[PDB]
């Protein structure tokens, strides 16, 4: 009638100034034994939540400087945006682009992008310029229509070059 | 005839855009912008949604962690790059003292935090690893319970 959970229990968690303690195998580096203080506020406390729990899936933050210019040429450039297009301080996630769309006579690189609630178009238009269309779900709006929307302007700038 | 005039006879009118920006393809930037508002708020800024100055953002990865591989990398490695996990909660590395001199025998000890709260491990001889938990709101902090487990750590060395 002595285990590990009484030899820390009396050498180590009597003292109170440890909320608990346990024994890692130097080998895995998981917990075998281990004691807390609980039992006082609730009686179904299981102490194993706090030494030992499976494998599962974290975040890491990175910092980046994002140049949000850049954002767009990468798009055309490169076919991708690894940390979504920037526009305004906002985040779109990078999701379709369609390259040499055929629209009435005239080829358009578009690209497509999701926010909440919302996304962007942009448009490669010759004689050097893109156009930028946002759209806004809460407004009965979508990308559909406001990619048609987009392609219909577009092909005016695209008749001046 | 400007800009904001073409776009929104060409483009807000059609009440299907929430606003229309033009962007150089030499830097990117929107030189000419609409959208569409003066509905709610008649004091709004449109380049708010099109421009903005260089700035720094934060970019997620996803990682399958082992928490047992957290605490050895500890005194592998020396640091702990994403923290120590343990029980699902993430400890803020702080300090490893290695060498440390305790009444004749020798520990390597690291120092982790939690909000208002804390970890330390202490490797012992005869290979384990003593794990001890403090809690600021039981009174209790980082340097008592250092103590009270490096002292704990004496007498598993003594019993190697």
């Known amino acids: 009638e002595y285990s590990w959970d009484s030899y ?13 303690a346990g024994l890692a195998s130097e080998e ?9 203080q609980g039992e006082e506020s609730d009686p179904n406390f299981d102490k194993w939540s706090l030494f030992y729990k499976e494998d ?10 994002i140049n949000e ?5 990468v798009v055309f450039n490169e076919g991708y945006a690894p940390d979504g297009v920037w526009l305004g301080g906002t985040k779109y996630q990078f999701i379709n682009i369609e390259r040499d769309l055929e629209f009435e006579g005239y080829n358009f690189d578009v690209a497509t992008c999701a926010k909440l609630k919302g996304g962007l178009h942009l448009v490669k238009v010759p004689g050097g310029n893109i156009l930028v269309v946002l759209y806004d779900e809460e407004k009965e ?11 219909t302007f577009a092909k005016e700038l695209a008749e001046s070059s």
């Not at 599962?56 to 400087?65: G, L, P, S």
């Not at 210019?69 to 040429?73: D, F, Y």
């Open 8 to 20: 820390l229990n009396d050498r180590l968690l009597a003292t109170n100034q440890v909320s608990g």
């Open 28 to 36: 895995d580096g998981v917990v075998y034994a281990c004691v807390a």
């Open 56 to 65: 599962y899936d974290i975040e890491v933050k990175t910092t980046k400087t």
């Open 69 to 73: 210019g850049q954002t767009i040429l």
């Open 141 to 151: 709006q979508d990308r559909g229509n406001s990619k048609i929307a987009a392609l």
